[PDB]
Amino acid sequence: SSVLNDILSRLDPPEAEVQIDRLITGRLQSLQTYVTQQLIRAAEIRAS
Amino acid sequence: SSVLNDILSRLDPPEAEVQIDRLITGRLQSLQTYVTQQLIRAAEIRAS
Amino acid sequence: FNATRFASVYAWNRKRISNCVADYSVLYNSASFSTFKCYGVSPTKLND
Amino acid sequence: NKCVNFNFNGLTGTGVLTESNKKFLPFQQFGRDIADTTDAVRI
C-alpha cells in the first residue's frame, strides 16, 4: 500500500514493520534523490 | 545489528546473508551518496 | 534433560542459567528431542 | 605483535594484541572504541 496507517490498524508488528522497512527505504531515496536534484539546480544557479 | 561478525558467530547462512543483504544495500548507498557529495564539492571547487 | 519434574505452563517454572560450561552442539548431535529450534542463534557455533 | 584472526576468551576479533598502558578500571577488561574495537582486553 501507500499508507502505513491502514497496515497499523490491520496488521501485526513484524509484517507491518518489514513493509514499513521497504516503504521507508523508498522514501529515503525519494528524498535524497530530490536533494541531489536540488543541489545540481543550485550548482547551475551558483554558476549563473 | 551494525555488526555482521556477531551474526556470523551466531547465526546460519541464509538469515545471516539476508541480513547482510540489507546491511550491504545500506552501505552501498552510503558510499555512493558520499561520492555524489564529494563530486558536487569538487564541481564547486572546479568552478572556483 | 533428565528433568525430574516441570511445573505447569500456566505458571511455567523459571530457572537461572549462568556460570557454567555447556556444549550445546551435543543436543544437535543428540537428536534426543522432538524439536530443537535455535532461533536467533545457530546451534552449531555455541559449544565454543 | 603479529596480526591474526582470533577468538579471544569467547570474544572474537582479528588484529594484534600487544601490551597496553591505557587505564581499564577493575570493572573493565575489554572496552569498545569506534567500530566496537577493543583498546585493551582481559590488556
Swiss-Prot record, chains A, B:
It comes from the Viruses. Subunit of the fusion protein that is processed upon entry into the host cell. Mediates fusion of the virion and cellular membranes by functioning as a class I viral fusion protein. Contains a viral fusion peptide that is unmasked after S2 cleavage. This cleavage can occur at the cell membrane by host TMPRSS2 or during endocytosis by host CSTL. In either case, this triggers an extensive and irreversible conformational change that leads to fusion of the viral envelope with the cellular cytoplasmic membrane, releasing viral genomic RNA into the host cell cytoplasm. This is Spike protein S2'. The gene is S.
Swiss-Prot record, chain D:
It comes from the Viruses. Binds to host ACE2. RBD also interacts with the N-linked glycan on 'Asn-90' of ACE2. Cleavage of S generates a polybasic C-terminal sequence on S1 that binds to host Neuropilin-1 (NRP1) and Neuropilin-2 (NRP2) receptors. Interacts with host integrin alpha-5/beta-1 (ITGA5:ITGB1) and with ACE2 in complex with integrin alpha-5/beta-1 (ITGA5:ITGB1). May interact via cytoplasmic c-terminus with M protein. May interact (via N-terminus) with host bilirubin and biliverdin, thereby preventing antibody binding to the SARS-CoV-2 spike NTD via an allosteric mechanism. Attaches the virion to the cell membrane by interacting with host receptor, initiating the infection. The major receptor is host ACE2. When S2/S2' has been cleaved, binding to the receptor triggers direct fusion at the cell membrane. When S2/S2' has not been cleaved, binding to the receptor results in internalization of the virus by endocytosis using host TFRC and GRM2 and leading to fusion of the virion membrane with the host endosomal membrane. Alternatively, may use NRP1/NRP2 and integrin as entry receptors. This is Spike protein S1. The gene is S. The chain holds residues 536 to 584 of 1273 of the full protein.
